[model samples]
Target: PEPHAVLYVTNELSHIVKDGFLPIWKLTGDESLNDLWLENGKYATDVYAYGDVSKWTIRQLRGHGFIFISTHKNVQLADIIKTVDVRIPREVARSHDMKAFENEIGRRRIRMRKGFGDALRNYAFKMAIEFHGSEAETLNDANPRLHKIYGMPEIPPLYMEYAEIGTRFDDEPTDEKLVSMLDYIVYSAEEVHYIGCGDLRTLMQFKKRSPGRFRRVLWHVYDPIAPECSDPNVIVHNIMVDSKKDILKHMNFLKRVERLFIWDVSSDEWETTRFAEDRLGEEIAYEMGGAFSSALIKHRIPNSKDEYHCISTYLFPQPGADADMYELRNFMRLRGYSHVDRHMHPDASVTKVVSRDVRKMVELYHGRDRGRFLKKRLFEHLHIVRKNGLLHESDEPRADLFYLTNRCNMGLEPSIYEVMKKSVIATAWVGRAPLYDYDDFALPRSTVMLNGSYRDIRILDGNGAILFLMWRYPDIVKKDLTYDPAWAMNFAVSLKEPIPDPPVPDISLCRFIGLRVESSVLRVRNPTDLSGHLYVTLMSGAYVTDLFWWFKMILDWSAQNREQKLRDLKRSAAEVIEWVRNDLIAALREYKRKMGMREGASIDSWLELLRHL
Candidate 1:
């Protein structure tokens, strides 16, 4: 097989040959072909028509042996090709026509540059001619006819040399130089290289010049235009623009240089400016149409129980003497009184109404006697009742009141024991109570002031007992009540009898006080069902009789000690504080060791250690 004709087409030939026709007329004679060819013997003078070539329609011939297309006006052997297969003469003619077409394209491209350059020079000459008259005309005019007619001087030899240099550079196909030139055009100082064009040769030249600069190179192709070509290094994007009108009329040749498809109407000015400035509109337009959607759902539900019950009791010391009783009486009187005096004797009356009114005169006298007589009778009756019972002797008239005083003074012992026994289910506050500690008290439990003052009263119980006593106390206590010999005999007898041979005369008779002051005032109120029975039990014991008073005394001591510790810590070094913490731990351990108890890993052990510290 022998090859005869070579097919060639411009890389952007589709824009020219879009009408499905070739831009070539077949020559019959060899002499006609020779005459058509220019002195270079490669292209003809008609091919140099700049815009005229743009009007042509070109067909692409497939299954070609080879092709020669001129990037420069200079043609090389590598650009040459031959083929003999003529079974498809139309295809052969098509291939040859494309070669001629590309040659024509290159010729016009060069002419366009020259034409623009010459036009610029002519414009400058015209401006100079208008300004400097005949002298400027002589310097600008390159033709002999212009010089002969206007008496124009010859252009300087250096000017001709500079013009030749510009034309030569423009005519040369310096693809390597173009790679760097286009690089600068596409990238600013902050932006990366995003635009690319042409074959692998051009792209490689670009990468070699500036390695690792481009993240990706976009390769564009049209199979109908340039078929069966592949480039591995570049990512290929296929673009086709179809027009309803004649392709030749609608096809924009410059559009083949890049495909910029920006759909945002709002971005028209921005895209235009970007294209004018950075030349990256063509590269960024493809990525603009990508989008996606997401949603989040959150749900919440609540489950909680709000049924609660509590019980608290408090005790107060009894005022025994007339003066002491009057003070208590006056205190209660001042708090409870709503009005001034309502009774007066007529003879000594200060008001005129009392002196004149008959009802007032009778009520004033009778009411005082009735009140005094009722108080005296009640006191005498209570004395007689207690004296008749086996619990007290007939000789002791004030025994019950004395017993009541002793019961009132049996303070913290009952609270401590009750708290310890109920510790499995409840927390106890012995000295100063924290704010949250009063939540279990049903009655109003006041806050203990930080400065050792009384506020209010409360009692304690286990969770179940508190709830039961809060709602159904009278029934539960009635069912549970039973006679215990120690409580019934021993305890009751102690209240009645004095010590026969006392080391201290008052010691046996002295009762422990159960009353507590939360603030400055003593609170006397009914016992909450939980603590009322336990209070009576603690008051009966001789050893634990003064426990409540004793606990307050301990609290006073602890407060003083705590204040001193805080002061010492403030003055001490960090090492001293650390040493104190270590020493406290060691002392706790030593106490446990002395008690013959192992350090068990339990809440009790931790609490025990805390107590020792």
Candidate 2:
């Protein structure tokens, strides 16, 4: 969609509460309004919010809720100082974080643009006058440039004070800017609008450190990776900090803020501006209740694991397919249909009708050979569906185009092997055979099968040991936890020897990836449980590993010298970086090139686009 027309934030905030966004707890003395708090973190920040509504900064009549009169024209700012109680927070004059935020108090300042300061300062003051805003408040966000708005001796007329090089996101920051911020600022520190920090430890950091207590900073990560935004299941501590700072001080910041707003600026769709949903507080968050029922809905909700049959023969999913598919997926999920996607996931019920049209394929032919053009194109894609001895004609309307199966997931399921082989043979591409397959996403385990053509001797000479874990790299809470995953062929040591000491039986997470291969483009994080055990593998027609697995890995390895070849065969930080720059780029280039300049690149273009040159 057009960025200009984007509904940026819809049902993002549940309640507007008249003038500024306030939490249910603070607004109405209700404690059960507790679900909004961060359930976990290395000290998380409470929820935060923005009071920038010119009527809440309606980006052009996107409109508002039933509280429009009360929300848009109300005078919450006038009594903001008196109507509510404010408190003086802990002193920060000596804290390291304090000095850092103080450093941000404005440096060699210069301005080339007009009215810039006016807007900046006005934004600062209006935000101040807006809530009479905050103090001792911890603003958790990626763009730390704006915290001074709430900083300064509880000072107003705030200008850009200090700015520092952002620390590595995953790593702990040397200075807790928000901590220092709380030190200098005065009262009402509760209401804070944190950074547009992306997902990962920091995202959780802000929530737990300065939670959305009594209010909401965010409902879900506006942009999400999987279905779960607040994944509470702890595997390893992603955020490991030394100071533990003043867990009490950080925790105190949570109970302080009222209308906190946390943003995810990392999203391509990320924005601090308000959209239709912001103004319209009609969200009815059925999933959650009490005050936050109006929370923003997720992009991908539950959906039918049942077959979403392929009706088109356009190679992979259609143009803009993911979004369209996700929309429906969300709807299905909303209605209670769930698809786990993991073959090993015992409850996973996802399935798709495996079918493809057999024909030479469609390539807008040009040479004035207009004779029987339709017939020619049809025959071009025409091919026999015959495989493993069965002669299934492509055109009989029953054998080829009509041949599809209800493939299901089972213990070490082998359905994908056949499913993938058919998808390629049946579908045709313009310049290639759609090199990446959907099966790849599952991290095909067809390789090293004990039951296949290139089957390995179950009883190896003497004792080869199952080759459990060959984990050398992969930085972890305990590298001990980083075992030699199935992804690492050359090494699979006793992963059981690592973390948890006693080592839980059969509890394996071998390596960072499942389909560990040098290349193939998209399966780096491919979905795979890749256990070091039991696989009902049977592909008498295949190789030591499945053709797809070996072929793609070889394709990548061939392009690499011994150095990369070795690294490619395993997982490491440097290898990943290299793949992203090289192999990943090629994949992206192909994707963009296929979609053309308009349909894809115009929107998907990244700094890497220079490679297209």
Candidate 3:
């Protein structure tokens, strides 16, 4: 449907009519307001004045509420009422967002350049807008939460207010610079557009200040007043002034002008400039609101029994020290920590911190009798503890265990084992080791690093322990944590007892696999925990290996296929051991060209082969 009557609106009214009443369409052009209004009778029913209108025009449309005078005039007077067509001006808004209006005008002008249907099909134009505008005391008081929200120190009085920044925006142009700017502004485009910014007085007298300058001046101001000069070229848009809208008014004004000029300096980066919303504000708010602190607290707080502090202590090897279970018991007592459970390290050593009751029970007998007793205890204790929380770094409460036909000979200085004996007994006082399934043993146990050089111990295990509590590595780095590069690993072999002299695998022999095997004593800590086997000090490089891990893996695999393997393995123990050796040999062959197996390496194929066996 076509419009009943076409209304001719100035650029100021285009934004409203573009989104307003649908029955009628509006026409807008750069043509002088008087010329457009006078010729409107030829094209449509009436002229809609959004820009400033003359007294003669105001009187002519006095019955129409003289709404144009609201934006264009400095002084406002009540309009004379007269009967008018109900359809005309009925949908015009009495109040609007002033800054929004300026943005719309700028947008419409840009759209006009981009070919808006038939209206601007043949037009090519360029536009530039400038805003001449602020106050310090009022602003400081107005934004009460700004400093608190942004976490910035209080800004001093009377810092770069709006006008201060605006004037500094290239106020000085040298002769050469002025010529260059003139070249761009005047000669760069076929049709140029200028949006001048000034107070009511300056804007009203703009044509007087520069004769024959702009074809029409659209003044968008909060202060409405009648212009003395009725120059048909001037168009005033006096938006209703409100202190609350000041920032947006100035902000959007600058924004529209920013699109025209490539500013060399950012207002945000300026020392005196403060935006209500900016990066500094966002970061400050985040830090002040405890984002980092919240995460740290959440982590420090135990999620479950499985996430509690894991204390791992290293007993320094002393020359004549007997493993004192009392010292560890006392330490746990003092620290108020219960013993969780124990497992082997990746290096294949029995971890300290075993059960006190279990160790004592193993001590009741000698040799094989002790062995049988501890083996039974191991299985019984494991069964009892599976339901108990044995927190791994990866939580696995009901875990799996592996049984070896021959226990891994974990070579340790007898004194080292003594400390572990005590720790195990100490932890045994509280939590029972949960062995819901043997997988309980397969799950890696969390350790609190208790031994190391002071610096290394602090960094490696500080989080689980209390030394340097609440201090993190990142925090230390910022404060500069240092280490001595000259430091070396020093291990003292206690000579109080006969030290085992097991020969380690030759580095040259296994250089292709990059395997380093060091043969030490077959003495394990708390020897009674495994079968009571004599501590042999035979030194054969070929016989020494960390293959205990593989044996354990076989046990775990056997458990994984418990139903089938249990039925199939009714043959002979001797036969299984033979196949185990062959399986170990195959593993070496598979990894001949690569690095040898580490503790957690995938052994699915080897386990699969073992299952078949």
Candidate 4:
């Protein structure tokens, strides 16, 4: 042990030795001690006892000795470090786990090295957040309360006016405008397919709007009676495609159709009927979530394989009403669709709730900025990711990098966000939704996934506050399968942030765990995109145990036992891992058998048959 080496001990019993002449140092576990200059940061030579200190505490105490005495019999020396010296009572000496002590000491001394604490502190700084705001306003609107309470005001009205849903026209009324554009949308395509066909008037007008273009209009409705268009080019089919089987029934028709449109929500019929809040109305309107999922899956098939190009549009589940828009886009991206285009209508449509006069007054007051004010008012009522349309352009240009780079600016410290703005090359969502405590949606800009080209990664929360900062030696990419340089040496800072009260105090920790991604269904789309970048991982529930241990370690950083604190933590970790392993193994076994059964009966039955042996 070096002369003047500070003896790090837990405060639980560090008080026992506080009477010493050498000022009993209070360590927060964040200090990076230097061996050369004892005052640089009071570096420890040996740990007085081993109970309360964390793996990281001992990580800093590497190359140090362990000192134990008979007085602290209650102090369990479970984690004996390098060069242990124990003075036990005559009877207790034989009971002391000297065998385990020697084994731990032997294991630790071989792993011990100099300057690890300093290296760890340097690594912590490397994890600082490097941010890049995709758009200026995203940051301005990045408050969780804004999204949770106020919602996003800009996007909804942008598409709301675009749809002509809330505006008035001097000569042309809203329905007339929508009817006129129906053919315009159909005119560009060789043939059109309208799913969830609107009422008879909308359909009749759609066919009549352009008689020539109506030649190839394939109307797919639940049923059509009376004037069931025997017209030559206009074909009517009694088809309601709620499932993939329904979609496949018209597969050939789908292949040839250059344009497909769905008006799942009818403004005309809804104009006469209104409901309070429209939360349930919106949910019903959002029936397209599943339908869109099925349709997009089909859209993905040919667009990906056959290089087919088709414009798929739907009206009722349009973006901006709520998170429908956001979740819809998430659905698209998850399915590997890149293009989403929103088309607004020309004239304003009538509303059932608000009269035309009120709408007129709203327009008169808001003037050119009517969209902004209207969207804000809409946000006041709804919390959603509203967009007008999800246009799947067949031209899939380099889709690999877009999802990784596309980020929303968070409402954080604007200056702090800009502090490292230009240096960041990538960003990722790290946490769960701020509104729902248990739900996990893939929203953009939850955290900054700073580029690791400089051999380190930094993360910042939505508030532009550094959530975690860590650096690794060598490139983050060049790691042995079992060894990651990033985890070898690390440090954490205790930046005091107020804990939430009551129902849940640490929602931020939820983000940390979800980012670690302990889930059964991990849809890894493309494995290569992860190359060269350092990302958070899934370590099952043990990660929580490790995190809690780390938390206690940081909480008691300065202080520890024979340290009972260290031993308790070690026991806690063992208990947690044992429980987690049992749960994980059961889950994995079930999922494995389920998948195996699927494989055996489907394509690889032989593998399943052999596994039965």
Best by TM-score: 4
Ranking by lDDT: 4, 1, 3, 2
The TM-score of predicted model 3 comes to: 0.13
User: Which stretches in model 2 have alpha-carbon errors above 4 Å?
Assistant: 1-280, 283-407, 410-415, 418-479, 482-613
Which of candidates 2 and 4 reaches a greater lDDT?
4
Q: After superposition, how far is residue 293 of candidate 4 from its true place, in Å?
A: 12
List, residue by residue over 216-255, the lDDT tens digit for candidate 1. 3333322222233344534342323222121123223343
Query: Could you estimate the TM-score for every candidate?
Result: 0.12, 0.15, 0.13, 0.21
Best by lDDT: 4
Candidate 3, residues 1-613, lDDT tens digits: the string is 0001222244444565545423233333344534433343232122234433333321223212122212232322223222221211222323454345434433433332211111111110001010000111111222211111111111111101111111111112122221222221211111111121224343334333333323322222332343334645433334332222321333232222211111111122333222221222222222322111100000011112221121221111111112231111000001111121212111111122233322332222212211222222222221121221121122111111111100121232232223222211100000113322122111111111111111111111111111111112223121111111001000000101110112111110011010111112222321110111101101111111112222443444434564655443333110111113354435433332232333212234333444553
Q: Which model is ahead, 1 or 2, in terms of lDDT?
A: 1
If candidate 3 were superposed on the true structure by all CA atoms, what would the RMSD be?
41.8
Q: State the C-alpha lDDT per candidate.
A: 0.22, 0.21, 0.21, 0.27
Which lDDT tens digits does candidate 4 get at residues 348-454?
12212222322333333233212333323322222223321112111211011012212333343232223223222222233322322222223222112211111
How many pairs collide in each candidate, listed in order? 29, 66, 38, 35
Q: Which 10 successive residues of model 1 have the least lDDT summed?
A: 292-301
Q: Hey, what RMSD does candidate 4 come out at?
A: 26.5
